[PDB]
């Protein structure tokens, strides 16, 4: 089998494309910009400054998973069992995971919170090896009979850049990063799930990790803080989709409008 | 299963959160700021200059453990047994451990100094390898069946900053540190003990080990010197507790007020 | 035998030369320039800026493979058996493989888009380990009875230059490149097939990879953006051919003129 | 036990403390600054310039170990067999060991010069590996039936400053030092004996090795040259001893007054 | 034996001295300078800019090898059946090996070129590793029964200098070169054959590789361009012979005068 | 026992000192300055510029080993067995070994030149790996039952300083040197033989290798040119001898006066 070696026919590609599902962000304009919601079989980067709502979209996504109405798919190309009792893995790199906030967004979504918490796996990663190693251990979690359908890496680069300071080591960091990006892409594809990552920015404008990361994300956003609680999502890279801006808000309800 | 892999569910996170218990520091103001006292299942950092009292708080924590009335827990949540015959580990990195100082504190506190001394295991560490390894051997100490309910690391970073001078190997250092922070956090959580780390500062305001240490510690204090024997501990990082200041004294009685 | 180590005798080189075939690029001039077209047992490089058509030629190439009329060979020395069910492999470095563009190219040239997508393997590589390893796996695709006659490496250098930003680790880069470059040649030469690499450029005039690449590339082009949709391809290094330019276009038909 | 894991109870520490013995230096003023003599279970450092006595003290000690009256201890806590047939190890790093000088010192202290040579082991180390490896090999030397009670390391740092010259690989050095200081300490403790190290000085007024060494040396002197054959030794680190200066002389007899 | 260890007696040296044969370069003047021709059991180096004829000499030697007359030995030291059916190995570093030139040179030699191509193994190398390995694998070519009497390395340092650039891993390069030079000398010696190497020149008048290469090559020339097709060869380093210049030409014959 | 681990008692050192024998240099002044001749059990270094006579002494030494008038020892301490059919090893670093010069020196001293070549083993080293391996391998030659009594390293540092050129990879050079100096010191001591090394100099006035070498060689000479053929060795380091200058000549006879 060629599929076995990591190769895919032009046709395999066309086939695997049918079984993409999309997860709603609780946001009309944001959903619209993505063409329905966040895709399975892709890595999606949300980049921006502390407070731009990256961690928030992450937590919203874990609640939204526990609501089958928020998962859009072709009923013909994807079985209901594919998306059955779906679960999420949340790799927490800086301690951003808020159980309460899960509860809160759930309550407002009418989803049971207790239920979300029970279907969300949380891996507290204190350094890049742990981070990488956790992403790998997702195969084992699936193979434990856990239908992992959502993967969150929050954040993607925090550890790497706390570890590699001083340009005398970039090339290892860039190489680990590429490994990690590879794994992330691996499990989006071969377990048909959505893979979301949060990232930071810098000057004179870019998301951390240079091209290694950019080339390896399918969909890339910037998140800017608009007035008060409104936010803007700038989609600037997409496999086919056009480049657009979604405004939305983060309130006590969670993500809205 | 998933536990074996390092993953916890949201619901396990709340289930954890009921069995947390608390150790008094013998200062009312410091216990107050702490929300009752030093918490288990968290790493607690005391940063500040030589002579600011960090070693004193580590010692007092060893004395206070051997006093059932100094551990605050939920009777309906934490078995009377899980917290009985409590032992501390004191990984001593610059030779700060004074048994004479233990005596003094226990006497004054009305505790048997002898008892204290007998349930405080001291591990003298001359370098980061020894320091890091002793911490992992805590797992082994509890396998033998010792109720380790307190882990001291005094100090957290002295070895690392003596082993790494000049930007040469700085990336290894930063990861070695992250690896050490994981073990510390791992053993606070898994064994429901309190973990205290002392650290130094540098300018114009920070604790050594950068953010790699920072994100890894759940409570963080800077300890300042007041006049004479008074000191001020400044909680500036905690999950759900307000940034407050706590004044106290260091006397022949140990930590008081 | 000496038919096992890596030494091809002089005579073996001549007997080697007998079995070379050619694949039309769909331009008259470009073909002309090439001694007839893209040689098997050789590596061919298209270097130039983004949008210069490098990728297009790769695609055009995959399409053209499934059309025995576009494959010129020795009737008497290349047994017509050996060129049948010809499959292509396309190692894709930054997500350039457009399956639809394969449809397009196919139609406007009267080929089964379906046959082409069916006989094109696509290895998505997120880093240079994956890229090199995909390349080594072509031995194994063949071992499972796939008549791989076309290899595409698009890009040749995008992963390397992303991993070795910061020229402390340049030597391992260069060596890694070299090692890959061997593979590419070995498998052109031992499995009688054509290997195409695309490359990017720099300044004041050179193709990325320097000389390690240059010395291992047998045919070498610069691709310049002429007016609007026309393009020129400058052949600068070849075994025995004249140095010359070639114009053609890129349209919805594909590579033309 | 915990005892074998590297952990000592606070009671074990008190226990251990009863079995520390002392070793006279042959100078009254020096002994008194040491509060008896060179202590077992501790590392002692003499640091000063070439010619300031350091090596003389090592020699003098090798002699004095074979005068059983020069050993001070608690006959209640240390048995006569623990200090019986006492052998010294002399790790010679630059060629400082003078058998002649050993004879000489002994003839004058009424010790049999021959007995001394016969029970002083000498390891000639040309480099840091050899030096460290010999220190570790003291285990096997004892595990062979040799009551090693005195270990000389003269010099402590000469090999390292000759191997790592000007910053760059400073870290491997600083950790190799740490590993060595670990070993020296361990065998002082586990085999209840005296470890003495010689060291040089630098710019100001500090001993080579920085803090890795300082934090790991229990007692630390600077030895200055007074006039002619007189010297002064400055105690400036000790757990419970007053910092103080001892004057003494070096003569045909060895250390004296 | 001691031969097995790589040790030779002074008498073994003289005995080897006997079995040395020499290969003509078709240059009278070159030949004479060499004291007869290229020596076996030595490494001969041709250093010069591109176009100076190193490759010409290399090729010519491959042909002259195939010419019974052209190999001068001693019949009272060496048997006709050790110089019989000789073969050459030719390591190609930049793809300089032109089998057509082989043919041409050979036709003009009154020797069949086809024969030469059959008695000439060519290893195409794209980097240091492959380069080194092929030269190792020559041992094995003598094992399958091949009478390898001529080893060509063209170029000696092109790969290395394409890999190691700057001051980064210059030491890693110099040691690699050394290992390489060991191998070449070893097989020159132990399989009594002639080893030739080509090299580039740099800035201020030296062959690339420095002393590592120079100390390790018995015979060294600086080949310069004279007027037109005339070339001059400066022997500057040799065992016993004086430093001399020899003029010659490169033509349709190959090397002449 | 302790000789196994590398420990020598003080009395074993005294014993050692008795089996010490000495080899004449053929120079009166030189011999006188050495207190009789080059010593077994010691490493003697000759350092100086090219042409200073280093190699010449090496060669003289290989000759004088074959003339038993030229070996001085205690017949009571050293049985005539130990020094019978002695042999010598010459590790040759830059092709300095001259059988013809061995012959010549030997004729003039009335020794059979053939005899000297037959008991002189010659290792040609092209890099420090070989250099070091060679030296280690002398054990094996002794095991095969060759009475190795003379080890020459001509030269000590040529490889190392050729291989290293870049201040960060200097620390391995130094440790590698130290490792080898250890080997040389080992084998002088273990096999009661003389070990000679030649070294080049730098400026302002030092021999290459620094103190890593200086501390590991017992006897040390700076050899300078006089007028014409006269030469002057300056002994500047020796355990028990005064610094002194010895003048001699180098001629077709060899070393003389």
Author numbering:
A (entry chain D), B (entry chain E), C (entry chain C), D (entry chain F), E (entry chain B), F (entry chain A): 58 to 260, 269 to 322
What's in the article?
Homologous recombination appears to be essential in the repair of double-stranded DNA breaks and the restarting of stalled replication forks. These proteins facilitate a pivotal DNA strand-exchange process between a single-stranded DNA (ssDNA) and a homologous double-stranded DNA (dsDNA) in homologous recombination. Here, we report the first crystal structure of hexameric RadA from Methanococcus voltae devoid of its first 60 amino-acid residues (Δ60MvRadA). The Δ60MvRadA protein is composed solely of the conserved ATPase domain found in RecA orthologues.
Similar to the previously studied Δ62MvRadA, Δ60MvRadA is active in hydrolyzing ATP in the presence of poly(dT)36 but inactive in promoting DNA strand exchange (data not shown). The ATP-binding P-­loop (residues Gly105–Thr112) was ordered with two putative nitrate ions, consistent with the requirement for a high concentration of sodium nitrate in the crystallization solution. The peptide chain was largely ordered except for residues 261–268 in the DNA-interacting L2 region (residues Asn256–Arg285). The central channel is lined by L1 regions (residues Arg218–Arg230) and has a diameter of 10 Å. Each L1 region has three conserved arginine residues (Arg218, Arg224 and Arg230 in MvRadA) in RadA/Rad51/DMC1 proteins. As a result, the central channels of such assemblies are highly positively charged. The conformation of each RadA monomer in the hexameric form clearly resembles the ATPase-active form. A short helix (residues Gly275–Ala282) was observed in the L2 region which corresponds to helix G in EcRecA. The conformational similarity of Δ60MvRadA and the ATPase-active form of MvRadA in the helix G region suggests that this short helix is inherently stable. Unlike the structures of filamentous MvRadA, the hexameric Δ60MvRadA structure revealed a different conformation of Arg74 which is no longer capable of retaining the salt bridge to Glu96.
